[PDB]
Amino acid sequence: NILRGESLNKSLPILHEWKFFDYDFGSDERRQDAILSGEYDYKNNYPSDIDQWHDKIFVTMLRYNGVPSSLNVISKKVGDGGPLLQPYPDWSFAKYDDCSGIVSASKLAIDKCDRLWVLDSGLVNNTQPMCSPKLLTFDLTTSQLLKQVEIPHDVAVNATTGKGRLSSLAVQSLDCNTNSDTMVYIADEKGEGLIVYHNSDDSFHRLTSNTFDYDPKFTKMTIDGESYTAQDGISGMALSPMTNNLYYSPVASTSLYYVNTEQFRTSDYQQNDIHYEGVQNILDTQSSAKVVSKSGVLFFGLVGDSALGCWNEHRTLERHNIRTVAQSDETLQMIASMKIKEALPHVPIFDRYINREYILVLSNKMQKMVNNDFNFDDVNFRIMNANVNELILNTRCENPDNDRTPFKISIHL
Amino acid sequence: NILRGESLNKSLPILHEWKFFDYDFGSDERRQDAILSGEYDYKNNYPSDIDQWHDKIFVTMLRYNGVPSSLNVISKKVGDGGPLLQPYPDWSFAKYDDCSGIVSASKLAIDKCDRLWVLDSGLVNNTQPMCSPKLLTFDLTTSQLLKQVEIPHDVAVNATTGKGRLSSLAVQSLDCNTNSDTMVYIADEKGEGLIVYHNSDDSFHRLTSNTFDYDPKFTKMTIDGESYTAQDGISGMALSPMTNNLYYSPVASTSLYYVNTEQFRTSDYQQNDIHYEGVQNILDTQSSAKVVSKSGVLFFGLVGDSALGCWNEHRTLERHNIRTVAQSDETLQMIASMKIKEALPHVPIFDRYINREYILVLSNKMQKMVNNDFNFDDVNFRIMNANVNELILNTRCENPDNDRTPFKISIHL
Amino acid sequence: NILRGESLNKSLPILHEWKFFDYDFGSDERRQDAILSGEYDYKNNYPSDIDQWHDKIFVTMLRYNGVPSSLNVISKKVGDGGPLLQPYPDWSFAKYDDCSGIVSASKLAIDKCDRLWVLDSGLVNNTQPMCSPKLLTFDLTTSQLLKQVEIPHDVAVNATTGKGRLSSLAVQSLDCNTNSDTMVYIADEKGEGLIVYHNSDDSFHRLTSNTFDYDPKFTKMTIDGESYTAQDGISGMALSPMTNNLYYSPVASTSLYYVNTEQFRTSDYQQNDIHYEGVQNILDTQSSAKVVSKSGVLFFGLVGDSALGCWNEHRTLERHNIRTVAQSDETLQMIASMKIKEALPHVPIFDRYINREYILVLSNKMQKMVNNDFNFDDVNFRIMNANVNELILNTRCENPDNDRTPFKISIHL
Amino acid sequence: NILRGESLNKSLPILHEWKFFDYDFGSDERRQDAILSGEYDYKNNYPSDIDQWHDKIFVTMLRYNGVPSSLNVISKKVGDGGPLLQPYPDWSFAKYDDCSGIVSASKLAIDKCDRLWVLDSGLVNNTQPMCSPKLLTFDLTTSQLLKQVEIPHDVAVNATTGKGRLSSLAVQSLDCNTNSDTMVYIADEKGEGLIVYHNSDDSFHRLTSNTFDYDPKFTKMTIDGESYTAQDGISGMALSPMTNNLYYSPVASTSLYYVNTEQFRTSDYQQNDIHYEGVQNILDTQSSAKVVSKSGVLFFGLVGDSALGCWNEHRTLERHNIRTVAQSDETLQMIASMKIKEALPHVPIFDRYINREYILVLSNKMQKMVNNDFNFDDVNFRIMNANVNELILNTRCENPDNDRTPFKISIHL
Amino acid sequence: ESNVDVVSQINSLVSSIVSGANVSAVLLAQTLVNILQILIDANVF
Amino acid sequence: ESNVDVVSQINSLVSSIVSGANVSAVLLAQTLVNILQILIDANVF
Amino acid sequence: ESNVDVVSQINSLVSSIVSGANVSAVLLAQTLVNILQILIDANVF
Amino acid sequence: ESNVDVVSQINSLVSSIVSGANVSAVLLAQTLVNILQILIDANVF
Numbered sequence A, B, C, D: 001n002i003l004r005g006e007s008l009n010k011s012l013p014i015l016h017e018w019k020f021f022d023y024d025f026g027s028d029e030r031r032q033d034a035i036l037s038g039e040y041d042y043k044n045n046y047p048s049d050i051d052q053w054h055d056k057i058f059v060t061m062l063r064y065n066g067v068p069s070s071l072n073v074i075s076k077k078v079g080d081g082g083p084l085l086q087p088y089p090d091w092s093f094a095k096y097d098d099c100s101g102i103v104s105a106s107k108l109a110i111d112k113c114d115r116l117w118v119l120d121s122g123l124v125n126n127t128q129p130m131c132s133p134k135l136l137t138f139d140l141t142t143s144q145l146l147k148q149v150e151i152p153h154d155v156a157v158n159a160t161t162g163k164g165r166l167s168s169l170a171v172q173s174l175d176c177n178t179n180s181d182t183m184v185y186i187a188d189e190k191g192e193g194l195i196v197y198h199n200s201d202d203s204f205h206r207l208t209s210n211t212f213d214y215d216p217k218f219t220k221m222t223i224d225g226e227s228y229t230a231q232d233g234i235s236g237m238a239l240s241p242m243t244n245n246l247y248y249s250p251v252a253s254t255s256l257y258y259v260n261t262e263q264f265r266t267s268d269y270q271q272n273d274i275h276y277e278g279v280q281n282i283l284d285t286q287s288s289a290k291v292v293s294k295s296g297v298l299f300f301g302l303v304g305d306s307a308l309g310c311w312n313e314h315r316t317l318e319r320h321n322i323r324t325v326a327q328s329d330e331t332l333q334m335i336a337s338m339k340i341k342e343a344l345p346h347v348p349i350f351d352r353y354i355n356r357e358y359i360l361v362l363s364n365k366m367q368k369m370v371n372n373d374f375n376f377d378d379v380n381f382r383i384m385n386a387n388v389n390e391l392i393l394n395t396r397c398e399n400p401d402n403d404r405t406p407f408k409i410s411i412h413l
Numbered sequence E, F, G, H: 001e002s003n004v005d006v007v008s009q010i011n012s013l014v015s016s017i018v019s020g021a022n023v024s025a026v027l028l029a030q031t032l033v034n035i036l037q038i039l040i041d042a043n044v045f
């Protein structure tokens, strides 16, 4: 039903791939010293989120014992395992012992203001909170730390359970003029909560609901046959530009919900007022990461079937409309990050001749990380690029099209 | 099943359209004189076949009482009803009273030799044979009649029934060098026969089989609700460049057959030897016209459902594989001609960046012609252009694709 | 004084050169047949006038016994002696036996109407009049004989002496619109007369004066040491576009005269009325050919000194102002034709950045022709091209210049 | 004789011109403060030398009481009097009170190493020595003071007279590779001496001769009628790249001498050994500034006749060969600086199509400065640019030319 | 030049090119000028 | 674009090129557009 | 220039353009030269 | 392409242009390619 027949075994073009992660320390002797000192270990590097800016591919690494730097940009030099990473901006921010630098970069987001938003989980080994979580704003043109904010402890974790790990970050800007009125949403799965931060107000508000909680029935997740158990709440938030709707789905459930950000415009923040609209059990498997294109199409990742599914916002939300586009067991093990970008430079007149939206997907084998069974002789981590219009063409997810031009150009990285 | 859900109400871009057909006699007074003399009547002009050459759109008109010229090229001048036609090459060939000129041009075909092949039905009113049928070869660069051959009477019509009308023409060239070894296939529905003409041998051979005969059960054809009865044999031949297979299907049946042209290479032409391979009743409705692209995809026209269907040659021939791409009651009433062309100039290196094949489809309302109920206040005849790769993308008909380039360009007229 | 010091031994770039003249009869066998029949002889070909049109170099040959064609265009094929000539337009006009074709082309002129004006001397061997002289107008775009006029016998030759040979032709057009009001001037040295032909009136008028007569003192002319005696009248007419003044000088004198064409505008043509303004004995040697550029500079050829001299019309006419630009004994033996052209296409805005006027000069050794002493192992005939502005720069002949642009471009063939 | 007839009243294109000199202090209030403090006075600014680098025009100002900065680059902002100057590199070097900055920049020179050589006269009011003379080497790409050397007192001034003012500076580089072997020549007129500085040896050597001394007979100099008396020695040194000959002429004499730099290659520096080859009294008037182009043409300035003269090195040195090119009383009052540059970027293949050398000449009215009679309502100081090849074309100074290309391009600023 | 006019010119030029007819030089130059002007207006360079 | 304006732009561009400075891309493109438009107006093609 | 090399150059140039980075002039000129040479070899003009 | 060959091609092309004949497109394109290649070799860009 949901799994489309033609989608079977279809893969995506691979922009980059790594057998493992190697860092550009400089000379080979410096790499040897780093390995000897225990700073760098190739068995404890796992990608969390990726992003792109004009020539740069930023990748976030979960802060384990052997991680040299949490946030790294892809460098031109290519190692045997894969392309070499380079600390960003420099090694000064990589030093997290003082906690001045980034401890652990969880997710990334880039707005139209050409600003990089970095979320610091603070957790080390993803289970031990070392330092306070941070929201960092960097200027991508000057490579400087524009702003740094510290998340309050009370809003970060539940007062009852006492545990909380930030998982997803989304940035919305009603107006990115001289003063950017940006409302940042941070979803913490361990706390099963949502945090709304108003940049203008410099205020954090915590919201909780029964929808954010996990379902014990669907905790088990089977990827490529191997099964692992995880108990996490709300994660994978995608904000639709067209409808201003923030979508979400608990990690341990198949139901899909969404909320309207217009309810958050009121400074009142009335508790129990927020109305969450969702459908219960519309998917056979869980959803890992979601992203909404400006055309109005939502892409999500089916973990159990190891596939990519799409849904058109204009059409009704039901199992009939939901369809898959890409299916591959090896190419798409676990989708951890999806980012939709557009071609540049922007020309208003020529937009009719060009399909500008292209999607970047990160695939890392999380079931191997959980069970500590990684074969470093194969390609473990992949980054793929695809064209949205040609990926959703002639399907249920396609938008009403009009062929008004003699030629059409499809653009992807 | 065969009718795909997304294909519903989908239309194609319209290159040209006519409320009725008007000819460019020159001055308005000449048009008035032609109308007064009875040479030109706007109620007796119906398109049969279309073709394109570098700037020209050739259209064939069935020779009725009021037809000024059977074959006409689209001219730059545009009348109120539609773009004006112009006799080709001149008015000398339009004069069919002496029979020197073309009496009635049934079908057209263009080879890679830049030669135009014209089939003369000879029939006037499509029921009365006036002059002998002809095969004409014109040079499209010099606009001269290169060659003219006359079809023998015995091979033209059945000796028993005594009736026969040529319906379909296909041209195959094993080698179009200085001497063109071209085998021309002419399918006559009224005679239920096939004629193979060898240009090198200057020989015509007639072949008949039970497959070429019509089925009385499926004589009735319903277009847009209105139903008409027709009893015709084999028509709509398409020759696949990849497999050298000539496909066909009787007008009054749903079965689809094909033959291999390699059996015709032997000069023996052993009777009852030719093996025709086909499937019985794989379509709900009849097929009007068929065309095979160089990639290996066959497009046919479902008359009853008023749609366009496709089938991939690589995949097995069955109802499961057969799917529709375009469905429209008004836009596609009756598909009388389909031609697949490629973009020019040919560049071998850049072929990976461009989808070159584009299809041209002619739609005329035949059910109105049969019942003599034509509303000349609306758009009766249409010509549409589409891109094959984007039309068959993400369907059963698509070929195994590989996205090896950052950008892809789709080209259609 | 007149001979400038820096001008000594200065030469001009050579566009083309011939040891002798060879014609492109076609195959070598045709050339052999022509030589055997006596039609073609390489010892009796001498250039008279040259002209250029967009790719073509027209050359006129005096009609001797062995001349195949009087008027010939330079062809692409190159013989051992030099580039091969080709009859223009075809061999039909080369056949002068019927007198329908050109007997002997004396001089050429091209107007802004893109028309070629050909003067037919009629004389064979330059001493025997065979057929009547003709004025021919050809269209250089269609290669057709637009018009042909026959000069009356009475105006052609003196009634008293009875001898007359047309030597120089000049074309002036007050308006070259749909009807070209062109006044053609033909100077005959043997008759010592001038003929004014009005194309609109189709009338020829003959004018004579004491200035047109020769001086017996200066009959002897010494070129490169070798001296020959010639008794000829007015020749070498140049019409200044700026001042509408026709300049002339008798072959056997050094005085230089000019007349105003405005006196010829009156249909009266009052005899003895025409006022000729000139200076007596301003040159050490005789002047062969003259040409006036549109800027207002007159170039003439000093036969005795074998040099090229210039005079600015704005400045006063005296020996002080007259100066030489090019001096060379071998390169410039006898200057028989000079034509000043301009670069194309014409762009009004860019004229300030480009010096457009370039001069073409023909050099043939006339003293060798008179004495019948030609060394065919050397380069006898030459065609040279030069840039006028750079040739007259920083001299008495230069016009007041203003360097208003950062860059200046000099153009010559 | 020397004054060519056509050169009369000929002027040169003016790149820039000033009624007076105004500096870009910034805001108008800063200019008002500078004027009030006495730092800036418009009556005490006189140009000494000019130079050009890729977009910059460096101008040197004699250090008087009211001079804000000795060395200034032309800025984009344009004042009412003329284009505004800007201190170079900044105001730090303009502060000469500490003597760290430039006291008085006398002359400038730019080598192929992209280095600026600045000579500091040290004299204030051109009669009082305040600080020691300096040789400064600046990098024109980084705008930094690469090197600074101090000239010894003994070699700077005569031991007997005790007076000496540095007047001319020339830079020669046998090899401008990583280590630049540059021999700098400084001619001091007041000391009537020459100083050779070897950059590799860091050694200064002083040479004197009877030729360097002035002639009392020619002390008086008449410019534009007004006469002033000056007693100065050797000045205006030009080094020929082709012949490696340093030319010179005393200010108060008309004789012209030159020396060969190869004699200076020996580290011995044998006294009275150096052989100076010159001609006595070959000019009617004195020579102010000289410059030698790479083609081999020397340009000098005739002060008395207010003209520009040229001499070809290949031809013999005599009054017959020496000729003038530009003559103008108002445009060229007193030529203080001449620099010959070439077009960029350098393309070896295209050099045949382009005349690359262009000369820049500075004209300031020195006779007005001496007599303190300056009309600030008129254009006092001018900078002119001309093309060398077109300036010397068709004269005695021209080099043997060959027109081997259809088009020639002349380039000047 | 109107934007719709530029779009129509581009659509005609591309159709003429892909059709195989002889493309006129003046039309191609005019289309190039219009496209370059539009790009300049967008500060692409 | 006025003809005098085009002449001034050409004179500035050529001077900047021969001077050796870094020529801006936008100015070069604008000058090229103006020159092509002038050539088209003259029916050069 | 090898055909595969030209294809790689085109793929790198288009990716750099659509990425938004500053495209080097020399690389663009070299790609243009290669494309024009290929078109000339195909008798497009 | 040899440098002398490029010079000869440029000399023929300029002469054909200034003469007024119809300049072939293929020759102009080849000359443009050669000139651009020479400029690239000189690091003009």
Ligand SMILES: *[C@@H]1O[C@H](CO)[C@@H](O[C@@H]2O[C@H](CO)[C@@H](O[C@@H]3O[C@H](CO)[C@@H](O)[C@H](O)[C@@H]3O)[C@H](O)[C@H]2NC(C)=O)[C@H](O)[C@H]1NC(C)=O
Residues within 6 Å of the ligand: B158, B159, B160, B161, B191, B192, B208, B209, B210, B213
């Ligand atoms: C026109 O003439 C041709 C003969 O040249 C006729 O073709 C023949 O048509 C009959 C049926 O009408 C065929 O009989 C069938 O044979 C198959 C076996 O091949 C058998 O299974 C069927 O039950 C039936 O008996 C016959 O084979 C066929 N001739 C050949 C050579 O194949 C044609 O029918 C004539 N047209 C009309 C309108 O009658």
Ligand SMILES: *[C@@H]1O[C@H](CO)[C@@H](O[C@@H]2O[C@H](CO)[C@@H](O[C@@H]3O[C@H](CO)[C@@H](O)[C@H](O)[C@@H]3O)[C@H](O)[C@H]2NC(C)=O)[C@H](O)[C@H]1NC(C)=O
Residues within 6 Å of the ligand: D158, D159, D160, D161, D191, D192, D208, D209, D210, D213
């Ligand atoms: C500054 O000091 C220098 C010496 O270092 C002086 O140079 C000397 O000048 C005298 C004339 O004033 C020269 O005498 C002349 O010698 C030539 C032969 O070379 C002779 O033919 C003349 O009749 C005359 O006697 C002397 O040679 C020259 N020194 C050298 C080494 O050449 C210079 O004059 C001093 N400056 C002033 C203003 O006095």
Ligand SMILES: C=C(CC[C@@H](C)[C@H]1CC[C@H]2[C@@H]3CC=C4C[C@@H](O)CC[C@]4(C)[C@H]3CC[C@]12C)C(C)C
Residues within 6 Å of the ligand: A343, A344, A345, A346, A347, A350, A354, A409, A411, B350, B353, B407, G010, G014, G017, G018
């Ligand atoms: C066809 C070619 C050359 C490829 C070129 C002409 C195509 C391809 C990509 C197009 C740009 C896509 C994005 C964009 C971004 C958009 O904002 C403007 C158009 C532009 C620049 C397209 C311009 C045309 C491009 C560069 C050869 C290789 C056969």
Ligand SMILES: C=C(CC[C@@H](C)[C@H]1CC[C@H]2[C@@H]3CC=C4C[C@@H](O)CC[C@]4(C)[C@H]3CC[C@]12C)C(C)C
Residues within 6 Å of the ligand: A350, A353, A407, B343, B344, B345, B346, B347, B350, B354, B409, B411, E010, E014, E017, E018
């Ligand atoms: C992107 C553009 C300009 C459109 C141009 C660069 C694109 C479009 C069509 C492409 C040709 C298609 C066919 C073909 C036929 C093929 O054989 C060669 C490539 C070619 C000529 C393409 C060249 C590039 C074209 C002309 C603007 C309007 C934004």
Ligand SMILES: C=C(CC[C@@H](C)[C@H]1CC[C@H]2[C@@H]3CC=C4C[C@@H](O)CC[C@]4(C)[C@H]3CC[C@]12C)C(C)C
Residues within 6 Å of the ligand: C343, C344, C345, C346, C347, C350, C354, C409, C411, D350, D353, D407, H010, H014, H017, H018
């Ligand atoms: C500098 C170049 C290229 C030479 C080109 C750009 C120069 C030379 C001749 C100029 C034309 C002359 C005539 C004319 C005729 C005039 O009416 C318009 C300008 C034009 C076409 C000039 C255009 C610019 C030309 C072609 C390379 C070889 C270094």
Ligand SMILES: C=C(CC[C@@H](C)[C@H]1CC[C@H]2[C@@H]3CC=C4C[C@@H](O)CC[C@]4(C)[C@H]3CC[C@]12C)C(C)C
Residues within 6 Å of the ligand: C350, C353, C407, D343, D344, D345, D346, D347, D350, D354, D409, D411, F010, F014, F017, F018
């Ligand atoms: C003719 C034109 C355009 C002017 C252009 C094509 C001409 C003029 C200057 C030439 C450069 C001079 C210097 C040089 C420096 C030399 O090293 C390379 C040639 C070059 C760049 C010439 C190139 C051709 C130029 C730019 C229009 C205005 C009618």
Ligand SMILES: *[C@@H]1O[C@H](CO)[C@@H](O)[C@H](O)[C@H]1NC(C)=O
Residues within 6 Å of the ligand: C009
């Ligand atoms: C003129 O120059 C040529 C070429 O250098 C030379 O051969 C000839 O002798 C020169 N003429 C004279 C009279 O010296």
